[PDB]
Amino acid sequence: KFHKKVNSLEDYDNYQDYMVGYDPVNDSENLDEQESTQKSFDHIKSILPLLNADKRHLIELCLKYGFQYKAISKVMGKGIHETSREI
DNA sequence: GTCGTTAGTTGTGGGACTAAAGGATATCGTGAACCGAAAAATTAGTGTAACGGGTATCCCACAACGCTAG
């Protein structure tokens, strides 16, 4: 059904002339947004060393395994509730 | 008399057909039933308040004299 719901681009005469188009402005804007996000993350990384060591390691682990309160709690010693509160 | 050769058809197949603009479509037919897969929702479990010195910072106010005698 899906493959029979798909037409052929040849049904439109000279489809390569007026269809299947893109604007590089969109690509440049997407890359600019990516750069903005990267700059924000670099700002956060630079702020990280100013925090307490335990809270810095909590975030560092949460950024390389990922908000895994259970596995972090067993790793740390604090419970699920305490570890979530500290995060 | 018989077999290979050459030239002239004859039928058949493959390949061309300005430039500029524009550029919307509609798209049937049906057989059953059970099992497996994974994606989603529902449920079960733990909780602070002030205190001793001692010291880092903040705001907030004030001071930072002048003269006389031994």
GROMACS .gro file of C-alpha atoms (C1' of nucleotides) in nm:
model
  157
    1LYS     CA    1   0.000   0.000   0.000
    2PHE     CA    2   0.278   0.244   0.090
    3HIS     CA    3   0.472   0.170  -0.228
    4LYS     CA    4   0.159   0.209  -0.442
    5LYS     CA    5   0.077   0.539  -0.271
    6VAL     CA    6   0.399   0.688  -0.415
    7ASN     CA    7   0.395   0.859  -0.754
    8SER     CA    8   0.685   0.900  -0.995
    9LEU     CA    9   0.863   1.233  -1.037
   10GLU     CA   10   0.857   1.175  -1.413
   11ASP     CA   11   0.481   1.239  -1.403
   12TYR     CA   12   0.568   1.609  -1.365
   13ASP     CA   13   0.734   1.736  -1.682
   14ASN     CA   14   1.068   1.909  -1.623
   15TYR     CA   15   1.045   1.827  -1.254
   16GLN     CA   16   1.420   1.887  -1.217
   17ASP     CA   17   1.366   2.251  -1.317
   18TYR     CA   18   1.103   2.367  -1.067
   19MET     CA   19   1.090   2.096  -0.798
   20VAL     CA   20   1.317   1.927  -0.542
   21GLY     CA   21   1.473   2.253  -0.426
   22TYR     CA   22   1.656   2.386  -0.124
   23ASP     CA   23   1.792   2.716   0.008
   24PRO     CA   24   2.144   2.734   0.159
   25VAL     CA   25   2.023   3.003   0.401
   26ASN     CA   26   1.846   2.728   0.596
   27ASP     CA   27   2.168   2.525   0.619
   28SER     CA   28   2.370   2.825   0.736
   29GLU     CA   29   2.103   2.908   0.995
   30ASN     CA   30   2.107   2.550   1.122
   31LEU     CA   31   2.485   2.559   1.158
   32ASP     CA   32   2.461   2.895   1.338
   33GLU     CA   33   2.209   2.745   1.581
   34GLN     CA   34   2.447   2.453   1.637
   35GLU     CA   35   2.730   2.698   1.711
   36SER     CA   36   2.507   2.884   1.958
   37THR     CA   37   2.428   2.559   2.139
   38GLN     CA   38   2.797   2.467   2.146
   39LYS     CA   39   2.886   2.807   2.292
   40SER     CA   40   2.621   2.765   2.562
   41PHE     CA   41   2.758   2.421   2.650
   42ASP     CA   42   3.114   2.560   2.663
   43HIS     CA   43   2.991   2.831   2.901
   44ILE     CA   44   2.837   2.560   3.120
   45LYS     CA   45   3.157   2.355   3.111
   46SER     CA   46   3.358   2.661   3.216
   47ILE     CA   47   3.115   2.721   3.503
   48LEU     CA   48   3.140   2.357   3.618
   49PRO     CA   49   3.481   2.379   3.797
   50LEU     CA   50   3.347   2.660   4.017
   51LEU     CA   51   3.097   2.421   4.179
   52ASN     CA   52   3.155   2.187   4.471
   53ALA     CA   53   3.350   1.875   4.381
   54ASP     CA   54   3.069   1.630   4.459
   55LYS     CA   55   2.816   1.827   4.254
   56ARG     CA   56   3.067   1.861   3.970
   57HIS     CA   57   3.127   1.486   3.957
   58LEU     CA   58   2.751   1.425   3.973
   59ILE     CA   59   2.706   1.636   3.659
   60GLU     CA   60   3.010   1.487   3.485
   61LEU     CA   61   2.877   1.135   3.540
   62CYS     CA   62   2.529   1.249   3.435
   63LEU     CA   63   2.683   1.374   3.109
   64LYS     CA   64   2.863   1.051   3.018
   65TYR     CA   65   2.605   0.796   3.133
   66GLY     CA   66   2.299   1.017   3.161
   67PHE     CA   67   2.060   1.099   3.445
   68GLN     CA   68   2.083   0.738   3.566
   69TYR     CA   69   1.978   0.802   3.924
   70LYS     CA   70   1.978   0.431   4.010
   71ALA     CA   71   2.323   0.334   3.884
   72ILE     CA   72   2.463   0.662   4.017
   73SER     CA   73   2.309   0.605   4.361
   74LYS     CA   74   2.470   0.261   4.395
   75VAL     CA   75   2.795   0.411   4.265
   76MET     CA   76   2.781   0.696   4.517
   77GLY     CA   77   2.623   0.555   4.833
   78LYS     CA   78   2.330   0.792   4.858
   79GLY     CA   79   1.984   0.658   4.780
   80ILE     CA   80   1.770   0.730   4.477
   81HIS     CA   81   1.598   1.014   4.663
   82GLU     CA   82   1.917   1.172   4.799
   83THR     CA   83   2.097   1.142   4.465
   84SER     CA   84   1.805   1.296   4.277
   85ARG     CA   85   1.792   1.580   4.530
   86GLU     CA   86   2.165   1.648   4.490
   87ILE     CA   87   2.136   1.645   4.110
   88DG     C1'   88   2.190  -3.075  -6.385
   89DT     C1'   89   2.351  -2.864  -5.962
   90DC     C1'   90   2.576  -2.545  -5.620
   91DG     C1'   91   2.787  -2.095  -5.457
   92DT     C1'   92   2.782  -1.565  -5.565
   93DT     C1'   93   2.640  -1.108  -5.647
   94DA     C1'   94   2.338  -0.730  -5.681
   95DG     C1'   95   1.905  -0.535  -5.614
   96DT     C1'   96   1.519  -0.529  -5.373
   97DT     C1'   97   1.197  -0.588  -4.942
   98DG     C1'   98   1.061  -0.601  -4.474
   99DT     C1'   99   1.196  -0.462  -4.040
  100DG     C1'  100   1.435  -0.208  -3.667
  101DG     C1'  101   1.662   0.203  -3.439
  102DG     C1'  102   1.708   0.726  -3.421
  103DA     C1'  103   1.615   1.270  -3.506
  104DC     C1'  104   1.204   1.630  -3.477
  105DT     C1'  105   1.381   2.582  -3.239
  106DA     C1'  106   1.404   2.882  -2.863
  107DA     C1'  107   1.133   3.189  -2.384
  108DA     C1'  108   0.729   3.080  -2.009
  109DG     C1'  109   0.459   2.716  -1.690
  110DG     C1'  110   0.425   2.294  -1.440
  111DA     C1'  111  -0.280   2.147  -1.129
  112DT     C1'  112  -0.431   1.638  -1.186
  113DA     C1'  113  -0.607   1.014  -0.990
  114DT     C1'  114  -0.505   0.618  -0.920
  115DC     C1'  115  -1.083  -0.096  -0.818
  116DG     C1'  116  -1.113  -0.588  -0.719
  117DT     C1'  117  -1.059  -0.862   0.011
  118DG     C1'  118  -0.955  -1.486   0.282
  119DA     C1'  119  -0.943  -1.639   0.793
  120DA     C1'  120  -0.725  -1.726   1.211
  121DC     C1'  121  -0.362  -1.751   1.567
  122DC     C1'  122   0.088  -1.623   1.748
  123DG     C1'  123   0.455  -1.317   1.837
  124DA     C1'  124   0.656  -0.873   1.905
  125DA     C1'  125   0.749  -0.446   2.152
  126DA     C1'  126   0.577  -0.029   2.297
  127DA     C1'  127   0.322   0.177   2.634
  128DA     C1'  128   0.110   0.279   3.145
  129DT     C1'  129   0.042   0.175   3.596
  130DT     C1'  130   0.209   0.095   4.044
  131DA     C1'  131   0.541   0.080   4.472
  132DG     C1'  132   0.868   0.296   4.757
  133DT     C1'  133   1.128   0.739   5.121
  134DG     C1'  134   1.079   1.247   5.457
  135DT     C1'  135   1.474   1.789   5.911
  136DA     C1'  136   1.617   2.206   6.253
  137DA     C1'  137   1.940   2.436   6.531
  138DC     C1'  138   2.327   2.421   6.743
  139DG     C1'  139   2.937   2.566   6.976
  140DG     C1'  140   3.331   2.849   6.824
  141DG     C1'  141   3.561   3.075   6.430
  142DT     C1'  142   3.581   3.314   6.020
  143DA     C1'  143   3.486   3.439   5.485
  144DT     C1'  144   3.187   3.800   5.276
  145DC     C1'  145   2.805   4.186   5.251
  146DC     C1'  146   2.564   4.680   5.402
  147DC     C1'  147   2.598   5.084   5.703
  148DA     C1'  148   2.785   5.457   5.998
  149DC     C1'  149   3.182   5.724   6.162
  150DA     C1'  150   3.682   5.908   6.197
  151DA     C1'  151   4.104   6.063   6.023
  152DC     C1'  152   4.175   6.745   6.702
  153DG     C1'  153   4.364   7.142   6.860
  154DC     C1'  154   4.586   7.386   7.261
  155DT     C1'  155   4.892   7.453   7.701
  156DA     C1'  156   5.238   7.350   8.029
  157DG     C1'  157   5.681   7.107   8.221
   0.00000   0.00000   0.00000
